[PDB]
Write a protein that binds this ligand. Structure first.
Ligand SMILES: *[C]C1=C([C])[C]=C2C(=[C]1)N([C][C]([O])[C]([O])[C]([O])[C]OP([O])(=O)OP([O])(=O)O[C][C]1O[C](N3[C]=NC4=C3N=[C]N=C4[N])[C]([O])[C]1[O])C1=NC(=O)[N]C(=O)C1=N2/[C]=C(/[C][C]C1=[C][C]=C(F)[C]=[C]1)[C]=[N]
Ligand SMILES: *[C]C1=C([C])[C]=C2C(=[C]1)N([C][C]([O])[C]([O])[C]([O])[C]OP([O])(=O)OP([O])(=O)O[C][C]1O[C](N3[C]=NC4=C3N=[C]N=C4[N])[C]([O])[C]1[O])C1=NC(=O)[N]C(=O)C1=N2/[C]=C(/[C][C]C1=[C][C]=C(F)[C]=[C]1)[C]=[N]
Ligand SMILES: CCCCCCCCCCCC[N+](C)(C)CCCS(=O)(=O)O
Ligand SMILES: CCCCCCCCCCCC[N+](C)(C)CCCS(=O)(=O)O
Lengths: 499, 494
């Protein structure tokens, strides 16, 4: 029953919050809906795979909070394979390349690709990380879908095609579903377009040895009996002196404060007394999560390396079930695997098939993209459809439809009496990621410490020292990249000269 | 505990369903979250106002199911006052007019205005009521907001701004928030633009004497002790022989079947076992309700009538808190009142003020629009902010953001094992209205009757005879309206 803080949700954010509060000498309890911790991170273990992350997996430079938490728990990272060539597959043809971006030869298309990425970052610098709705043109950009923005920025179909896949891959949603302001914020708060898309020096650089599920599992071992599995929270009562939190099995928990560490829309699963204020009440009906199936196809050997392919494929085409893959082979070089994401409307569409039908379609895709018959000989298959999860709502994270972030964005992490809000969605740096989960979990925990008069106000938001293990090379631009004209800019120059 | 059907929700849809099933001889229970029935309809009574609808209120021709149900319960309608002139307030000036739509005098603006409304109805003709996702251009129309359609279609700012007001008023959401496909479906399934906007011969023609809350209240009286108030449903278990439904106060209800008669997104408040299928699991997080405050200012007399104004105001502009009003005076001519809607973003913005602050702004607005100092002396004020309701989620109804209706639309009323789906959102005619609530409640009830082998499949969807009290007159267009060019059409002719 009685404790200082009830934490709702035993994912990375809630576990990070409970650990901090526990380390500060408080009596904490974690109420987790599932028969496991980790939430949107999940590591399957069996003899065929040894271990595999079916949810969140990748970590990179500038994600210093998740890295410090994992290292303190005794965890280790390894580099995702990007030794050999990446593949860009478009119009049923594959084009090998090196570096983070698929190359473009056509001079007009090159100017258009260059300008697009530059403008994404240009617009990003106008958007405050901690308050996106404060951008000078917040309303104008929020009243617009990402599709509308692509339609007006991209003067070539090639750039529009690549930008569409970029959006699908980043936020597991269609360009027409998401606010332009929101998506521009989301990229900006991950350090920009290059940082977000990169394996080497980016978000996909590394994975944890043994899986990311260990983060939450090892925090559970530290907290012992304080974590309560199979306790979905149904009711929060704040009418009396102590906060009462009721679960589905009719257990009652009494606390001074509560941390909500669940996806914002999943707050709907809780009945509130007194009712939530007007803005939060409506906000939680307006914030869906994206759609993704994560699929891993195992092979006898990482045969793609022999053809000088690292395993990275960027696959454009409506026919392609998977738009993005990475090599998922173990660091020891065994359990050869290709990881792929089925994104947005394709997750919806391909979920109708059987596990066996999906495996078949993926192998047939990889065989064509890699130009390898070997790809038609899988030894094993694992997958996870996050759309069917009652206690996640989707993956990777929450997106904002047009008009919502400016109208409702400011209440996301605004406390409601004695309820404080964590979860990756409330973070200001790598929101949507395991990194943002740690940030938001530890920030929510400190808000409570301040409320109890244990720490000063200026200590609620805490900066993180850079990892020595995973150093961040800075994001650099060239003179040409900065000053090459857009397509309309070149046309302006043509019409002005020839006049 | 043990019954044939548990109905979740004591709104009009749930009550209609329960009444149908009860009259057919089944044991039904209604589980209602609030201390009252009615949901998005609510009739307040005090001696100052006598009675006032603070939620759903208006009914009109073609809404035959709500009219029949209310007539059986002993209810009667009266006509909303539209004898005198309507007012269009544009750029700080009032323009009195007659007929459902404000006149336009600039030739170019006239062509642009004409084309916009015509095109809305043209597009609607290709959208099936029972399956909007089967429209020929469903994906194209669903992937754009109403804002970009208006930007595309309206060559003049005058038309765009009136079209914007129209969207705001119909669906309590911003043009940029909503799918074009969904909005065009919404208008089409109310009988078209003219039918949805009209007072005389449209949706706003009539109100119930004594309030619309009496519909749900009188059905609850007919059901005896079968309606359970302050029983919010928290858990639905379908793993066993009969369905188990748990409430927040720990009570257990067992049934052969369930009707969910709540707004789709409020399905999130229930924990399901087994988990919901994937498409519904994600759908119920993708379907918000609009934002509105309904406000009624009372006066000593209906003074506007003396100046040959009926009370209807169509008010352009960002600064106007209220964009649309109706005379809310009682049929007897006493309790003189003006009803106004504070719509969409204005509802969020003006909720930060006090009740008294909102009253002052409305009175000053009405004084400008009506050209009368008498609007500055209210005798009484009532309001309801529907955004603050845990068990509604907003008003009037559920809107679909771009991409949603085509991807998730068909799951809305698709049964989940032994759970059937009612609620106005699942109706095919006047969805969003009290009428759709009745259609959906009775249809969901008959689906169960068919599942039980009591009626054939062809009796699940039943037609309704036209009301003798509120008959519908046909919607007509003129030759010029149908054949006048658009702005770009007039340009290609030049
Ligand atoms: C799903 C996914 C996938 C598939 C993938 C990925 C992901 C995901 N991500 C994301 C992550 O995972 C996240 O962010 C995290 O995890 C979050 O955390 P939090 O905040 O903590 O949350 P969660 O987990 O959900 O938890 C919660 C909890 O709670 C509970 N509940 C509910 N309800 C309730 C409860 N309890 C009680 N009561 C009640 N009522 C639940 O159960 C849970 O447990 C990620 N991340 C990272 O970091 N990384 C990665 O990798 C990931 N992934 C993805 C990504 C990447 C992709 C990309 C690629 C390429 C490019 F270019 C871009 C991008 C990211 N995101
Ligand atoms: C809010 C509102 C307002 C302000 C106004 C109006 C409206 C609204 N509307 C709408 C109506 O009302 C609706 O539709 C109805 O009501 C619906 O019904 P239903 O479906 O039945 O649903 P509800 O009510 O919501 O119910 C539900 C129930 O459930 C319950 N819950 C929840 N959750 C739960 C429960 N229980 C148990 N458990 C759980 N968990 C709740 O509580 C409830 O009770 C309308 N309508 C009509 O008809 N009329 C009218 O008038 C109305 N309004 C508005 C309109 C008009 C506007 C306009 C003007 C002008 C122009 F031109 C256009 C438009 C319509 N809409
Ligand atoms: C000699 C020049 C005459 C040009 C007249 C032809 C009109 C050109 C239309 C091309 C549209 C290009 N997209 C990318 C689709 C939208 C750009 C948006 S924005 O125009 O830059 O605002
Ligand atoms: C004889 C010269 C030919 C000029 C043709 C005129 C085309 C210029 C369009 C500008 C108006 C833009 N609005 C109205 C906002 C949108 C219209 C979109 S759409 O043109 O119908 O696609």
């Amino acid at each position: 029953n009685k404790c200082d803080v009830v934490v709702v949700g035993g994912g990375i954010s809630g576990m990070a919050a409970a650990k901090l509060l526990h380390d500060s000498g408080l009596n904490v309890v974690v109420l987790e809906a599932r028969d496991r911790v980790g939430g949107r991170t999940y590591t399957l273990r069996n003899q065929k795979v040894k271990y595999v992350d079916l949810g969140g997996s990748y970590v990179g430079p500038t994600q210093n909070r998740i890295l410090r938490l994992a290292k303190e728990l005794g965890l280790e990272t390894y580099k995702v394979n990007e030794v050999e060539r990446l593949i860009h597959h478009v119009k049923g043809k594959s084009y090998p390349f090196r570096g983070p971006f698929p190359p473009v030869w056509n001079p007009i298309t090159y100017l258009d690709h260059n300008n697009f990425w530059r403008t994404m970052d240009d617009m990003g610098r106008e958007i405050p990380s901690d308050a996106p709705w404060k951008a000078p043109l917040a309303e104008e950009w929020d009243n617009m879908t990402m599709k509308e923005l692509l339609d007006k920025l991209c003067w070539t179909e090639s750039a529009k095609q690549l930008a569409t896949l970029f959006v699908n891959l980043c936020v597991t949603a269609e360009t027409h579903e998401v606010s332009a302001l929101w998506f521009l914020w989301y990229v900006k708060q991950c350090g920009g377009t290059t940082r977000i898309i990169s394996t080497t020096n980016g978000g996909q650089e590394r994975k944890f040895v043994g899986g990311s599920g260990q983060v939450s599992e090892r925090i559970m071992d530290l907290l012992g009996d304080r974590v309560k599995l199979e306790r979905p929270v149904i009711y929060i009562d704040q009418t009396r002196e102590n906060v009462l939190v009721e679960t589905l099995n009719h257990e009652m928990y009494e606390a001074k404060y509560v941390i909500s560490a669940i996806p914002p829309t999943l707050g709907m699963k809780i009945h509130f007394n007194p009712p939530l204020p007007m803005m939060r009440n409506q906000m939680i009906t307006r914030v869906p999560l994206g759609s993704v199936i994560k699929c891993i196809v195992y092979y006898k050997e990482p045969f793609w390396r022999k053809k000088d392919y690292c395993g990275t494929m960027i696959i454009d085409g409506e026919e392609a079930p998977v738009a993005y893959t990475l090599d998922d082979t173990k660091p020891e070089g065994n359990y050869a695997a290709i990881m792929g994401f089925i994104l947005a409307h394709k997750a919806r569409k391909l979920a109708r098939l059987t596990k066996e039908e999906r495996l078949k379609k993926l192998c047939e895709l990889y065989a064509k993209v890699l130009g390898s018959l070997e790809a038609l000989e899988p030894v094993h298959y694992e997958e996870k459809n996050w759309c069917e999860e009652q206690y996640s709502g989707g993956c990777y994270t929450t997106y904002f439809p047009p008009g919502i972030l400016t109208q409702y964005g400011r209440v996301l992490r605004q406390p409601v009496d004695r309820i404080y809000f964590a979860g990756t969605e409330t973070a200001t740096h790598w929101s949507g990621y395991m990194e943002g989960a740690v940030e938001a979990g530890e920030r929510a925990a400190r808000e409570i410490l301040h409320a109890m008069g244990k720490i000063p106000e200026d200590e609620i938001w805490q900066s993180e020292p850079e990892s020595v293990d995973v150093p961040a090379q800075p994001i650099t631009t060239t003179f040409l990249e900065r000053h090459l004209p857009s397509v309309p800019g070149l046309l302006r120059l043509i019409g002005l000269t020839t006049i």
